[PDB]
C-alpha cells in the first residue's frame, strides 16, 4: 500500500520543480573518507572542513525543530546528518519531514562534527533518489530464497551480503594475480561451439539465424585451450563461465564460473603443487588466514603440506582386499551390492562412497581408472590408470589435474569407444596431430572454492542465480 | 599422403620402446632465457653453462656426420641445435635423421655455444611430440578464412598472429589495470536470463531441463549491472562476452567481448573523460605510443584532448537547416529521400550518413533523440534529447555512455511504448523503485577497440571465431 503514498511524493515533487532524480549532485567524499579523515575528533566539537556527502537514509528521528538521520553508503559505512531549522531552510525542515521516507538517497553538504557520534551539519541539502518501495526490516527475516530473487535489497539491508560479494571479487582478483606472477596469460576462447566438448555433460543448444544451424554453449574450454598450447602458448589460463545442462544441488549449478589452466613441460605432480599454492595464496590475500573459521565455530586448517593417496590402493585398504585395473565388474557390482554401468564408474563410486566421504583434511587422490578419463595421459608406469588427481577440500570436489593426453591416435580411440554408448571433434584431433607438447591442465570451481573456504552455500556465493 | 609416412614413424617408435609423447622432459630454460643470458658471446666460442631446452623443429639441414636444426619455441624465439655424431650417440644421428620430421617438438640438453648463430651442443636429446601433419610453408599463403579455421597453425607459422594474440591479452590486462587503479570492482552477472534485455537485439534462446522453460543468453549486462548500483556498489565494471542473434559483418559478430561500466555520482560528461583516459592509457601500456601506425603506412594520432559535437546541431549544419526534436518524420523522410520507421531512427541515420561517415579524428557526438535511448536520462535542460554519447574513433562506433535513467515511472513508460511495436522486466523496474543513485554507464567493444587501434579485421582480433 505505502507504495501509493510514495508515488505521490514523487508526483508532487515534479510539480514543484523539485528534482527527485537529479542528473548530478556534488558528492565530494564517501563516508569512509569522512571517517578516515577524522578518527578521534573530540566528541561534541566542530571542525570546519566542508564536504559533500550522499547515501541512504535508514535511521530517521523527526524531532521538532531538528531532525536526525543515519546515512549509510553502499559499502555500509554509516554517517549521521543533522537536518536543522537554524543553519538554513525552515522550509527545508518542512520538506525534509514531508518528503524524505526510508531507503531514500539524500545528499547533504556542510561542516563535519561529532555530537553527544560522527555527523555533518548541512548548509545545503537535496534528494538524489526517491524510493517507491520501503526496505523490509530484515526480520521480516527474508528467506534464503527471496534474498536471492532480490539481492539488491539484501546488499542494502544485510551486512554479510556486502562481505560475500566483496569476498568473491577479492578471491577472483587474488587468483588472476597469483597466475600472472607465474607468467600465465589469460586467453578468451569461444562460448558458442559447433559441438561442445571438454567434459561429460549435456550442453545447452540454441538456434542461429546467420548459419541456420544449432550451436552449443561450452561445457568446458579445455579443447580450445589445448589448441592454444599447440599454437605455442607456454602457460595459459581462462576464468569464465561454463554451462552444463543438468539439475541443481548444493555442489551443482547449470551455469557457474570455472578456472582452467595449462602449463607446458610439467605433470600432474607439478600442477597439484601450483594448485595448492594458489589456494593458500588466495585464502591469504582474501581471508587473511589459513586457519579458516566456519559457522560451526570450528576452524579448518589449510596450512602446511597436503596428503596424496592413490585411488586403487586407498580403496583396497578400505574394502579389505586388492582392487586393481584387473578386477571384473561382476566382482565390483557384488561389492557394490554388499554395501548399497562399468569398471571405471564402479571404482570411483566405491571409492567416493568409502574413502572420499570419510576424508576431512585436504587430500589429493590420484592415479585414476582409464575408462573415465578419456583426455588424460596413461600413467607412466602403472598400467590401467591415468595421471590425474581430484582435490577434496573440506569434503568438496574442488579441482582436478591431468598430465595431458597429447597423443592423437590414442586419443582418437578414447572417443571412438565413448561413442559406442558417430562424429567426433575432427579439428580438435587434427590439432593434436600438429603436435601438442607435454603439458598439465587443471580446473577449479570458483563457487566450490568459496564454499570449501567459508561453509557458504552455492546460492550465496553467486551474486545473481536462479 | 605424407600423413601416412608419419603415422608409421610413431608406430615404429612405440615398438622400440622409444617415447613419441613422454610424460615429462626436463626443460630448464625457454629459448628467450638462453638468449637473455648470453647476449654477446664471441661467436664460434663455447661456454659450459648447461641447459635443457625444447621446442619446434622448423629448419633442418641433415649434413652427413653432423645435422643442424632451428628450434623455435611457441613465442617464436629461435635457437639452433647441432645434432652431432661425436659428443654421444652415433645411433642418435641415425634416429635423429630417420625419426625427426618438420614441426616436431624436440628436447635437447647440453652446453650453449655460438658458431660461424646461437646454438646448443647436445649431450642428451629426445623427442617430446611427433607431428602427423607437416606445417604448410605459409606461402601456401593460407587464406584469411583458413587461418581462422586453423589458428593454432597460424600461431606457429605466422609471426603476426603471435603478436596479435599477445596484444589482445595485453589490452585486456591494461584495461583491468586501468579500472582497478580507479577503484572499480569487477562483478560477474548472469549469462542466462529469464528475459534478455539491456539493448536492442534478438537474443539466443535455449531450452532448460531443470526448469523446462526457455532461457535467454544475455545481449547485455546493463540491467543486472544497474541492480548492483542499487545494491550499493559505488563503481563497478564487467568484461565478458555478450551474444546478439544477428548477421556478421566487419563491425558485427554474434558473440563478442564487451566492457560495461557504472560509476555513481557522475554524468556522461564525467564518463567520456574516463573513457578517453582509459583508451589513451590502454594504447600506451599495450602499443607504446598514441601515434598509432596502420597498414597504410599512415599514423592516427589519438593524443591530446578530443572534440565533442552535438547530434541535432551538427546535423543541422550538414543539411543546411534547423533540425530539432520537433521536426516531423514526413519532413525527415523527404530529406532521407532527397539523399538516399520513425523520428529518432531518422535522426541518427541522417546524422550517421552525413556527419558520422565524414569524421576522421576522434569525436564524441552527444545529446541524442529520446526515441532511440529508452534507458538513458532525459537531458538536464535541452528538451527532447537524452544524455548519451557515441565515441567514433577512426570512423568506428567504439563506445557510448549515458547519464542513467534512474526514475522508475518514467522508465516504465519508455518500455510500455517500445512494446507497442506485453511483459516487461518487472524485477528490473522493482529495483529502480528501491532507489538507484545518480550514475553514468558506458560500454565498449574490445574488438572494435583493437580494430580502431590497429586497422585489423574483426576476424583477426579474436583467437577463435566462426
Ligand atoms: C557452483 C557449481 O559448480 C559446479 N556446478 C556443476 N554443475 N558442475 C560442476 C561444478 C564444479 O565446480 N565442477 C568441477 C569443477 C572443475 C573440477 C571438478 C569439479 C563440476
Ligand atoms: C566485434 C563485434 O562487436 C560487436 N558486434 C556486434 N554484433 N554488435 C556490436 C559490437 C560492438 O562493439 N557494439 C557496441 C559496443 C558497445 C558500444 C556501441 C557499439 C555493437
Ligand atoms: N575439463 C576439466 C577440467 C580440467 C582438467 C584438466 N585438463 C573438467 O571439466 O573437469
Ligand atoms: N548496454 C549498452 C552499453 C552501455 C551504455 C551505457 N549504459 C549497449 O549495449 O550499447
Short mmCIF file of N, CA and C in Angstrom, two decimals, chain A residues 140-222:
data_model
loop_
_atom_site.label_atom_id
_atom_site.label_comp_id
_atom_site.label_asym_id
_atom_site.label_seq_id
_atom_site.Cartn_x
_atom_site.Cartn_y
_atom_site.Cartn_z
N UNK A 140 10.88 -9.69 9.69
CA UNK A 140 10.92 -9.84 8.24
C UNK A 140 12.12 -10.61 7.68
N UNK A 141 12.58 -11.62 8.44
CA UNK A 141 13.80 -12.34 8.11
C UNK A 141 13.67 -12.91 6.70
N UNK A 142 13.96 -12.07 5.70
CA UNK A 142 13.91 -12.51 4.31
C UNK A 142 14.45 -13.93 4.21
N UNK A 143 13.65 -14.85 3.66
CA UNK A 143 14.07 -16.22 3.45
C UNK A 143 15.29 -16.25 2.53
N UNK A 144 16.06 -17.35 2.59
CA UNK A 144 17.21 -17.52 1.72
C UNK A 144 16.78 -17.32 0.27
N UNK A 145 15.61 -17.88 -0.10
CA UNK A 145 15.18 -17.96 -1.49
C UNK A 145 14.64 -16.62 -2.00
N UNK A 146 14.21 -15.72 -1.11
CA UNK A 146 13.76 -14.39 -1.52
C UNK A 146 14.90 -13.38 -1.45
N UNK A 147 15.98 -13.69 -0.71
CA UNK A 147 17.18 -12.87 -0.68
C UNK A 147 17.94 -12.97 -1.99
N UNK A 148 17.71 -14.07 -2.71
CA UNK A 148 18.40 -14.37 -3.94
C UNK A 148 17.63 -13.79 -5.13
N UNK A 149 16.30 -13.75 -5.02
CA UNK A 149 15.48 -13.16 -6.07
C UNK A 149 15.52 -11.63 -5.99
N UNK A 150 16.09 -11.10 -4.90
CA UNK A 150 16.15 -9.66 -4.67
C UNK A 150 17.43 -9.34 -3.90
N UNK A 151 18.55 -9.57 -4.58
CA UNK A 151 19.87 -9.50 -3.99
C UNK A 151 20.20 -8.04 -3.67
N UNK A 152 19.69 -7.14 -4.51
CA UNK A 152 19.98 -5.72 -4.37
C UNK A 152 19.44 -5.19 -3.04
N UNK A 153 18.38 -5.80 -2.47
CA UNK A 153 17.84 -5.35 -1.19
C UNK A 153 18.63 -6.01 -0.06
N UNK A 154 19.13 -7.23 -0.35
CA UNK A 154 19.94 -7.99 0.58
C UNK A 154 21.26 -7.24 0.79
N UNK A 155 21.82 -6.77 -0.33
CA UNK A 155 23.03 -5.98 -0.31
C UNK A 155 22.83 -4.71 0.51
N UNK A 156 21.59 -4.24 0.61
CA UNK A 156 21.36 -2.98 1.30
C UNK A 156 21.07 -3.22 2.77
N UNK A 157 20.27 -4.25 3.08
CA UNK A 157 19.82 -4.45 4.45
C UNK A 157 20.69 -5.42 5.26
N UNK A 158 21.43 -6.33 4.58
CA UNK A 158 22.15 -7.41 5.25
C UNK A 158 23.67 -7.28 5.09
N UNK A 159 24.39 -6.88 6.17
CA UNK A 159 25.82 -6.60 6.09
C UNK A 159 26.67 -7.71 5.46
N UNK A 160 26.25 -8.97 5.66
CA UNK A 160 27.05 -10.12 5.27
C UNK A 160 27.06 -10.30 3.75
N UNK A 161 25.98 -9.87 3.08
CA UNK A 161 25.87 -9.95 1.63
C UNK A 161 26.94 -9.05 1.01
N UNK A 162 27.11 -7.89 1.65
CA UNK A 162 28.19 -6.97 1.31
C UNK A 162 29.53 -7.68 1.39
N UNK A 163 29.83 -8.32 2.53
CA UNK A 163 31.09 -9.02 2.71
C UNK A 163 31.32 -10.08 1.63
N UNK A 164 30.30 -10.92 1.39
CA UNK A 164 30.40 -12.07 0.49
C UNK A 164 30.68 -11.61 -0.93
N UNK A 165 29.84 -10.70 -1.41
CA UNK A 165 30.03 -10.13 -2.73
C UNK A 165 31.47 -9.65 -2.85
N UNK A 166 31.89 -8.81 -1.88
CA UNK A 166 33.23 -8.24 -1.90
C UNK A 166 34.26 -9.37 -1.89
N UNK A 167 34.05 -10.39 -1.04
CA UNK A 167 34.95 -11.54 -0.97
C UNK A 167 35.16 -12.26 -2.31
N UNK A 168 34.06 -12.65 -2.97
CA UNK A 168 34.11 -13.32 -4.25
C UNK A 168 35.01 -12.58 -5.24
N UNK A 169 34.93 -11.24 -5.25
CA UNK A 169 35.71 -10.38 -6.11
C UNK A 169 37.15 -10.29 -5.62
N UNK A 170 37.34 -10.34 -4.29
CA UNK A 170 38.71 -10.36 -3.79
C UNK A 170 39.42 -11.65 -4.22
N UNK A 171 38.65 -12.77 -4.23
CA UNK A 171 39.18 -14.10 -4.48
C UNK A 171 39.65 -14.13 -5.93
N UNK A 172 38.80 -13.57 -6.78
CA UNK A 172 39.00 -13.61 -8.22
C UNK A 172 40.18 -12.72 -8.58
N UNK A 173 40.29 -11.55 -7.94
CA UNK A 173 41.44 -10.70 -8.20
C UNK A 173 42.70 -11.42 -7.73
N UNK A 174 42.67 -11.94 -6.51
CA UNK A 174 43.75 -12.75 -5.97
C UNK A 174 44.19 -13.88 -6.92
N UNK A 175 43.22 -14.54 -7.61
CA UNK A 175 43.55 -15.65 -8.46
C UNK A 175 44.26 -15.18 -9.72
N UNK A 176 43.67 -14.20 -10.43
CA UNK A 176 44.33 -13.56 -11.55
C UNK A 176 45.72 -13.07 -11.13
N UNK A 177 45.86 -12.52 -9.92
CA UNK A 177 47.18 -12.03 -9.53
C UNK A 177 48.13 -13.21 -9.40
N UNK A 178 47.64 -14.30 -8.80
CA UNK A 178 48.51 -15.43 -8.48
C UNK A 178 49.10 -16.03 -9.76
N UNK A 179 48.25 -16.14 -10.77
CA UNK A 179 48.61 -16.77 -12.02
C UNK A 179 49.39 -15.82 -12.93
N UNK A 180 49.31 -14.51 -12.70
CA UNK A 180 50.03 -13.55 -13.52
C UNK A 180 51.48 -13.40 -13.03
N UNK A 181 51.69 -13.45 -11.71
CA UNK A 181 53.03 -13.61 -11.15
C UNK A 181 53.75 -14.81 -11.78
N UNK A 182 53.04 -15.92 -12.02
CA UNK A 182 53.71 -17.12 -12.51
C UNK A 182 53.88 -17.07 -14.03
N UNK A 183 53.59 -15.93 -14.65
CA UNK A 183 53.76 -15.79 -16.09
C UNK A 183 52.68 -16.52 -16.89
N UNK A 184 51.49 -16.71 -16.31
CA UNK A 184 50.36 -17.18 -17.09
C UNK A 184 49.68 -16.02 -17.83
N UNK A 185 48.94 -16.42 -18.86
CA UNK A 185 48.32 -15.49 -19.78
C UNK A 185 46.88 -15.93 -19.93
N UNK A 186 45.99 -14.96 -19.79
CA UNK A 186 44.58 -15.21 -19.81
C UNK A 186 44.10 -15.09 -21.24
N UNK A 187 43.49 -16.16 -21.76
CA UNK A 187 43.02 -16.12 -23.13
C UNK A 187 41.52 -16.19 -23.07
N UNK A 188 40.87 -15.70 -24.13
CA UNK A 188 39.44 -15.85 -24.32
C UNK A 188 39.21 -16.85 -25.44
N UNK A 189 38.40 -17.88 -25.16
CA UNK A 189 38.03 -18.92 -26.11
C UNK A 189 36.50 -18.99 -26.23
N UNK A 190 35.94 -19.61 -27.30
CA UNK A 190 34.54 -19.39 -27.66
C UNK A 190 33.61 -20.06 -26.68
N UNK A 191 32.53 -19.35 -26.34
CA UNK A 191 31.39 -19.88 -25.60
C UNK A 191 30.35 -20.55 -26.52
N UNK A 192 30.30 -20.16 -27.80
CA UNK A 192 29.47 -20.88 -28.75
C UNK A 192 30.40 -21.70 -29.65
N UNK A 193 29.95 -22.93 -29.95
CA UNK A 193 30.80 -24.02 -30.37
C UNK A 193 29.91 -24.91 -31.22
N UNK A 194 30.49 -25.51 -32.26
CA UNK A 194 29.72 -26.24 -33.26
C UNK A 194 29.39 -27.64 -32.71
N UNK A 195 30.30 -28.18 -31.87
CA UNK A 195 29.98 -29.29 -30.99
C UNK A 195 30.71 -29.04 -29.68
N UNK A 196 29.95 -29.04 -28.59
CA UNK A 196 30.52 -28.80 -27.28
C UNK A 196 31.18 -30.07 -26.77
N UNK A 197 32.40 -29.92 -26.23
CA UNK A 197 33.13 -30.97 -25.55
C UNK A 197 34.10 -30.37 -24.52
N UNK A 198 35.05 -31.20 -24.06
CA UNK A 198 35.95 -30.90 -22.95
C UNK A 198 35.51 -31.52 -21.61
N UNK A 199 34.31 -32.11 -21.55
CA UNK A 199 33.82 -32.75 -20.34
C UNK A 199 32.56 -33.58 -20.62
N UNK A 200 32.15 -34.41 -19.65
CA UNK A 200 30.96 -35.23 -19.79
C UNK A 200 29.76 -34.51 -19.19
N UNK A 201 28.83 -34.10 -20.06
CA UNK A 201 27.70 -33.28 -19.66
C UNK A 201 26.81 -33.02 -20.88
N UNK A 202 25.51 -32.80 -20.67
CA UNK A 202 24.62 -32.44 -21.77
C UNK A 202 24.61 -30.93 -21.98
N UNK A 203 25.01 -30.43 -23.17
CA UNK A 203 25.12 -28.99 -23.40
C UNK A 203 23.78 -28.27 -23.42
N UNK A 204 23.81 -26.93 -23.44
CA UNK A 204 22.70 -26.15 -23.97
C UNK A 204 22.94 -25.87 -25.45
N UNK A 205 21.90 -26.11 -26.26
CA UNK A 205 21.94 -25.78 -27.66
C UNK A 205 21.06 -24.57 -27.89
N UNK A 206 21.27 -23.91 -29.02
CA UNK A 206 20.45 -22.79 -29.41
C UNK A 206 20.53 -22.66 -30.92
N UNK A 207 19.53 -22.01 -31.51
CA UNK A 207 19.47 -21.89 -32.94
C UNK A 207 20.11 -20.57 -33.36
N UNK A 208 20.92 -20.63 -34.43
CA UNK A 208 21.45 -19.46 -35.12
C UNK A 208 20.62 -19.10 -36.35
N UNK A 209 20.73 -17.83 -36.78
CA UNK A 209 19.98 -17.31 -37.91
C UNK A 209 20.96 -16.99 -39.04
N UNK A 210 22.14 -16.49 -38.69
CA UNK A 210 23.24 -16.41 -39.64
C UNK A 210 23.38 -17.73 -40.39
N UNK A 211 23.63 -18.81 -39.63
CA UNK A 211 24.10 -20.08 -40.16
C UNK A 211 22.95 -21.06 -40.34
N UNK A 212 21.87 -20.84 -39.58
CA UNK A 212 20.70 -21.71 -39.59
C UNK A 212 21.03 -23.09 -39.01
N UNK A 213 22.17 -23.24 -38.32
CA UNK A 213 22.50 -24.46 -37.59
C UNK A 213 22.23 -24.21 -36.10
N UNK A 214 22.20 -25.29 -35.31
CA UNK A 214 22.22 -25.19 -33.86
C UNK A 214 23.66 -24.90 -33.43
N UNK A 215 23.80 -24.33 -32.24
CA UNK A 215 25.11 -24.11 -31.66
C UNK A 215 25.03 -24.57 -30.21
N UNK A 216 26.21 -24.81 -29.64
CA UNK A 216 26.32 -25.42 -28.34
C UNK A 216 27.15 -24.49 -27.46
N UNK A 217 26.54 -24.09 -26.35
CA UNK A 217 27.23 -23.38 -25.30
C UNK A 217 28.26 -24.31 -24.67
N UNK A 218 29.43 -23.74 -24.31
CA UNK A 218 30.55 -24.60 -23.94
C UNK A 218 30.32 -25.19 -22.55
N UNK A 219 30.54 -26.50 -22.46
CA UNK A 219 30.55 -27.19 -21.19
C UNK A 219 31.90 -26.93 -20.55
N UNK A 220 32.90 -26.72 -21.41
CA UNK A 220 34.26 -26.60 -20.94
C UNK A 220 35.14 -26.03 -22.04
N UNK A 221 36.14 -25.20 -21.66
CA UNK A 221 37.12 -24.66 -22.60
C UNK A 221 38.28 -25.55 -23.01
N UNK A 222 38.42 -26.69 -22.34
CA UNK A 222 39.63 -27.49 -22.40
C UNK A 222 40.13 -27.63 -23.84
#
